[PDB]
């Protein structure tokens, strides 16, 4: 059985509305993790109960090279804890905020790993991810992609079945999600088009701080590219950012397989992608187990952490928070 006392709390990696992620050491083993700690009372107040449970469920039910692995999830009277593998390289958002643009080769590597994982989710797990963005893409010690945050996932979506929840991130929303008239798994390829456009072009494909103006652009404005972008990347992003999901690269029965076969990925051996046989073009340059240079100072320089059967409305006992991954 796992409690909070089993960990030493080292560095704050990030902080938000619902809680925090702390770099931790498991006392018994000496292993390092990222522990996401959420307040139950804030979860309930903001109606995030069902999404928390989905995060938990998808984490426990997934095993893939480019999906964040969960070691433990447990709970206290007022907290929910997910002990995840520590992705040393931080968010792709961290990197892109600084380098501004990635090379096409580097974006191809990241795109190939994102597709491999979304392919796995759609095909093996009948899951749609729905929140693809730079914040949810992390790099591991070797420079490989880790997708995080599965709370907006949709389970039990086979082939062409549809979803109706209006959700995601405003900047990244697919036109059919904004149309609010049912959507399929191809919303993930829109998201893929957005993040790859950001990597190769240095900006969002559509932006405006006023959401009403933002949503207008995503719905109405044809996709444009910086004129330095090469022809095979222009071809990929145009296909992914087709506003009609039936026209979208990946929008048909073949799904990811359509994207995998596009000329932009021409010499990608998709099995080698799965097997991590492709060498990452950037290896995180950390100097110790606790080096957090790829996390904002705003967090890392701060301070960290601030009844076993209580089941109340403000602090519910959550099911399936008794998890420890089998070896």
């Amino acid at each position: 059985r796992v409690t909070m006392n089993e960990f030493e709390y080292l560095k704050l990696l990030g902080k938000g509305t619902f809680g925090k992620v702390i770099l931790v050491k498991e006392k018994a083993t000496g292993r390092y993790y990222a522990m996401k700690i959420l307040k139950k009372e804030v979860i309930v107040a903001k109606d995030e109960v069902a999404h928390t449970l989905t995060e938990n469920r998808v984490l426990q039910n997934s095993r893939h090279p480019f999906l964040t692995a969960l070691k433990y999830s447990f709970q206290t009277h007022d907290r929910l804890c997910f002990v995840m593998e520590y992705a040393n390289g931080g968010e792709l958002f961290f990197h892109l905020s600084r380098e501004r643009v990635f090379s096409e080769d580097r974006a191809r590597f990241y795109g190939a790993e994102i597709v491999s994982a979304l392919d796995y989710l759609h095909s093996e797990k009948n899951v749609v991810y729905r929140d693809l963005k730079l914040e949810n893409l992390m790099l591991d010690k070797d420079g490989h992609i880790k997708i995080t945050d599965f709370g907006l996932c949709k389970e039990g979506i086979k082939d062409g079945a549809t979803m109706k929840t209006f959700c995601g991130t405003p900047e990244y929303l697919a036109p059919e999600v904004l149309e609010d008239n049912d959507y399929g798994r191809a919303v993930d390829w829109w998201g893929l088009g957005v993040v790859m456009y950001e990597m190769m072009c240095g900006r969002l494909p559509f932006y405006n701080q006023d959401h009403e103006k933002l949503f207008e652009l995503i719905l109405m404005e044809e996709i444009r590219f910086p004129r330095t972008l090469g022809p095979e990347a222009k071809s990929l992003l145009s296909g992914l950012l087709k506003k009609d999901p039936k026209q979208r690269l990946g929008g048909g029965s073949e799904d990811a397989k359509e994207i995998m076969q596009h000329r932009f990925f021409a010499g990608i051996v998709w099995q080698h992608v799965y097997e991590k046989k492709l060498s990452p073009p950037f290896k995180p340059q950390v100097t110790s187990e606790t080096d957090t240079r790829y996390f904002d100072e705003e967090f890392t320089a701060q301070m960290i952490t601030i009844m076993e059967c209580v089941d109340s409305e403000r602090r519910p006992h959550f099911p399936q928070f008794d998890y420890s991954a089998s070896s």
Binding site: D149, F166, P170
Partner: peptide
């Protein structure tokens, strides 16, 4: 660059 974005559901 762009500010951090926030996930939502309604």
């Amino acid at each position: 660059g762009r500010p951090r974005t926030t996930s939502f559901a309604e």
